[PDB]
Design a protein around this ligand. Structure first.
Ligand SMILES: NC(=O)c1ccc[n+]([C@@H]2O[C@H](COP(=O)([O-])OP(=O)(O)OC[C@H]3O[C@@H](n4cnc5c(N)ncnc54)[C@H](OP(=O)(O)O)[C@@H]3O)[C@@H](O)[C@H]2O)c1
Ligand SMILES: NC(=O)c1ccc[n+]([C@@H]2O[C@H](COP(=O)([O-])OP(=O)(O)OC[C@H]3O[C@@H](n4cnc5c(N)ncnc54)[C@H](OP(=O)(O)O)[C@@H]3O)[C@@H](O)[C@H]2O)c1
Lengths: 292, 293
């Protein structure tokens, strides 16, 4: 039970406030602390306990969640309190780099404390909804002990990765790259359809229907990438390349941007040059691996 | 019982045409077929399709006539000579082409008093007649409604009417392919990045798909902002997007993979910031996609 699983939240910015709110509404006794005291007021009025100091906030709970600007801020808060951390589980949902995650984990074992490094794939209003994804890396046992508590932040999207703490930051970037790819795809299409007086609101649901179809292509292409074998099946790179041609041309003609379609065409042109005219789109992995 | 009463002819039996005729046949339509190279019809004829001897026979055989050939040059070559023969027929042209070709062909069709729908197929042949198939139609609404049930044999869930401008089918086609490449390139970027830490693409795939599903909700929220020209930050400012694109690009260069796409994405964001949209949400990016380059 949640009443038997206390948790402290250190950092009550926009995201930290929503995490504390989620812990509280799921029935955890929730201790909070922020450098700027007034950011706790709304949460205190709703039943959270205001800690007197960072030390108190750590002592209050066996599970300690951090969510501040950067890992500089994290070290500033925790360095002085090494002794205070023994036997606690620290869950750091601050966004940072791979190396920061790994170095912080190293420092934590050094002072005998358990450390998970997380990454939040969500905006504050989506915390505690099925739309929330939250990634955790580090010791599996500590994740299992606190799984039920952590699921208060997003029951469906709470996801353990592996032991390397640095995976959380890598998966974060990788998923954001997908987000920008999807959204830029949609925006290109809205601009094109806009020249024929089609509204983006009219286009959205059909765009989403298509995005859902494409997830099946992701699933089919994945083993091809791992095996290094790129059978055309469906459609050759030559067919993709020709279709990219038409998108670029019709974009230049109708008076909108053609930069992305031309950039996409260039990548395909390189795969053709490397011998993959008759291979399928999975062969494009080779272009994304080539430096600069 | 309905399909037995709804004949359809298919003109063009290439890889895609064969799958369309197969779908019509297995849904119980009496299906007449014709191909220039006559032997490509054998498999379908053996399964119960009628071999039309000529294009004219194929047109006489059915009230609904579907074409699916290489290009609109091929389409005109086949149909021009048969103007008079087409009165009272519905011609459904699922050949891929440009906007202008659709509109010119529709003009020719009214000229010879026939009904003409211009379609585009967003599917591979094996996906025809599955819930994965999307098929787009533009032109007269009444003709689409009359034959909707029959057409749904090609993909019951994804058979979609757009509007009266015949040219819309080709525009929507391109727009959706752009989305496909954006999704797939996003996935490939991520697989290459995770591959440096010995994470397999198959381990990454399910999480990538979970995330793609979440992103559909962002598309839905951004769409009205685009139509209204008002781009409230809500969630995440362009400054936040810009910084995160920075980190993706840097970590990519460091780990020895391509950083061209992340840098290209950053460039577009840099221009939105320069135009004053630091505190706007991602919908403000529509302005960059509308600028001629
Ligand atoms: N907002 C989102 O949608 C979102 C999504 C995913 C991930 N994240 C990540 O979550 C983390 C927090 O984001 P946010 O949205 O809450 O940012 P924010 O609203 O700007 O708040 C930042 C928090 O860090 C604290 N802080 C900064 N420097 C500090 C220091 N030296 N000592 C003590 N406290 C310090 C702030 O204290 P004061 O309140 O005293 O200034 C505040 O509690 C970031 O790493 C962010 O990238 C955010
Ligand atoms: N394959 C796909 O995944 C796919 C997906 C979406 C859209 N499409 C579109 O579907 C259309 C057909 O593609 P496909 O994949 O079926 O191509 P295909 O396998 O190359 O077949 C082309 C068809 O067009 C016929 N043809 C070409 N010129 C002709 C002419 N002058 N007179 C009579 N017939 C002619 C061919 O007859 P012969 O057999 O006698 O050559 C054949 O039946 C294309 O516009 C394509 O872009 C295909």
């Amino acid at each position: 039970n949640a009443a038997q699983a206390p948790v402290s939240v250190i950092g009550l910015g926009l995201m930290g406030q929503a995490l504390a709110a989620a812990f509280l509404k799921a029935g955890h006794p929730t201790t909070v602390w922020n450098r700027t005291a007034a950011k706790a007021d709304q949460l205190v009025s709703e039943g959270a306990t205001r800690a007197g100091s960072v030390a108190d906030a750590i002592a209050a709970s066996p599970l300690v969640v951090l969510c501040v600007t950067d890992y500089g801020a994290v070290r500033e808060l925790l360095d002085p309190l090494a002794g205070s951390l023994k036997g606690k589980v620290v869950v750091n949902l601050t966004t940072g780099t791979s190396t920061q995650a790994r170095e912080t984990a190293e420092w934590a074992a050094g002072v005998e404390t358990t450390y998970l490094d997380g990454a939040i794939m969500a905006i504050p209003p989506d915390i505690a909804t099925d739309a929330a994804v939250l990634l955790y890396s580090g010791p599996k046992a500590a994740f299992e002990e606190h799984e039920a508590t952590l699921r208060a932040l997003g029951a469906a999207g709470t996801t353990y990765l592996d032991t390397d703490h640095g995976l959380s930051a890598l998966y974060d970037m990788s998923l954001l790259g997908i987000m920008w790819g999807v959204l830029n795809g949609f925006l290109q299409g809205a601009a094109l359809l806009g020249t024929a007086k089609v509204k983006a609101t009219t286009f959205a649901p059909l765009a989403n229907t298509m995005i859902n179809v494409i997830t099946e292509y992701v699933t089919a292409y994945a083993p091809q990438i791992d095996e290094g074998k790129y059978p055309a099946g469906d459609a050759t790179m030559t067919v993709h390349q020709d279709a990219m041609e038409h998108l670029a041309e019709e974009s230049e003609t109708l008076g909108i941007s053609a930069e992305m379609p031309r950039f996409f065409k260039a990548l395909a042109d390189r795969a053709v040059a490397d011998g993959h005219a008759d291979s399928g789109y999975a062969a494009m992995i080779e272009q994304f691996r080539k430096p600069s």
